[PDB]
Amino acid sequence: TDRVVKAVPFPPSHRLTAKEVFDNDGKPRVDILKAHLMKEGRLEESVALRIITEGASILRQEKNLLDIDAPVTVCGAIHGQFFDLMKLFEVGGSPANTRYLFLGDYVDRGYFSIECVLYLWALKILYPKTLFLLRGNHECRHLTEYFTFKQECKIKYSERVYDACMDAFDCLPLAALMNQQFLCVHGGLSPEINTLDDIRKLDRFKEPPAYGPMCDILWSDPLEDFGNEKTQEHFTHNTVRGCSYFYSYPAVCEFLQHNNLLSILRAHEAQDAGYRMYRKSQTTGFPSLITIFSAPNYLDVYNNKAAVLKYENNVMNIRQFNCSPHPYWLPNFMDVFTWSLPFVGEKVTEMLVNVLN
């Protein structure tokens, strides 16, 4: 009876129970989940931990290098944009009848990362053979405690949910082999990965180290002049990231030609049009490198389009989409009492300072 603005929806306080989310066969009801999560509605902590654990069990069974066949939708970095994730599934096709391959980076940046994790983990449980989730550089314990994802779990839910995600991200596969043609990673190649068996030999169930091929899978980036190189140095130090390497056009072409592949799908880097097809390989005729970015209007300032890749019927359909309205949040999930209390303490002090003189 004391609410000035009614133009925004009042978020619900009823935490979804285990009976409202899960059916009688242990299948999560994604319809109740989407409708509740989009209203900024929270789940019961026991349910939030149940969706993470049952999903991580399916992820722990999967291999380091997944076998995915066409038709399949290839998504890029989401970065906690849950209300843009809802438009991504409408552009790329409903998950109930379309294969999906995500390339990581589901958390951090966007202030709806836990909503993205709970919804993508619920689709992974409901579709354990048609939907696939790979790991990015942000699905670790070092970046989430630095990029407000730990704060997102502690404010919306509890620190126990954050601990469950750090154990669920360790189960995310590293790479994927799509249709025996394309290698799908997050960052890119590595100076320690010559064959696809080098991808299989890695122990992904750990925190991504600062070295080794596991770090280069998620952190490496293409050269700024990819395709127009000054030298032939295959891997140089990635000076922007501070770790991993820069892979060149001769490096990717040699890798594509050695393992008899066509291209390398990846994300990890923002694109103004949501995608970027790099220089064609002289021995294939197809773009040797393809960056995919599924975050429209990155950080609410980039004003960029986001693209998804729907590979079907020998056609690589890069389908773009724009952003969607999302609720507002103060930086680092700060409440209005913490934000305004210093201003209250300061300006009131200035009053008596000048009143009493």
């Binding site: 603005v5 978020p11 103060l330 209005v336 009492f337 913490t338 305004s340 209250v344 200035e350 000048n354």
Partner: protein
């Protein structure tokens, strides 16, 4: 300390332009250093304890005395809670929090963006479901995490 009462009597006397024993808002706004301040009216409403639209010398001392170094953390948070609680019913409702914040933020936030963070603040800080934040609920978020 009767020395402070006599010393603050002169300062209260200069602020009294009409010499009515009370201080109106326009008599406060005679201070050029209090113009650019969104919480002058709230402090005047907190100091006033009858509704005369004016702060007498007894209300002046009762209000100013809560700001000396001699005072526990509950005294300071008592005044801070009364900043948002406008009607002085003991609790802060959704409108009282939106209205007071509207003064401090000016136009740095739109109404649709200020209302969203106000609701989510109370939602994650209303341990009783009454739709409002109490003094103990106000203290469980301020001071520490």
């Amino acid at each position: 300390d009767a020395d402070e009462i006599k010393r603050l009597g002169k300062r209260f006397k200069k602020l009294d332009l009409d010499n009515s024993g009370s201080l109106s808002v326009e008599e406060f706004m005679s201070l050029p250093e209090l113009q650019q301040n969104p919480l002058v009216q709230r402090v005047i409403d907190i100091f006033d304890t009858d509704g005369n639209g004016e702060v007498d010398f007894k209300e002046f001392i009762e209000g100013v005395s809560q700001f000396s170094v001699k005072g526990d953390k509950e005294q300071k948070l008592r005044f801070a809670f009364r900043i948002y609680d406008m009607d002085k019913d003991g609790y802060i409702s959704n409108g009282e929090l939106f209205q007071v914040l509207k003064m401090m933020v000016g136009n740095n936030l739109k109404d649709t963006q200020l209302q969203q963070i106000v609701d989510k603040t109370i939602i994650n800080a209303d341990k009783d479901g009454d739709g409002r934040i109490s003094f103990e609920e106000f203290c469980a978020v301020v001071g520490g995490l």
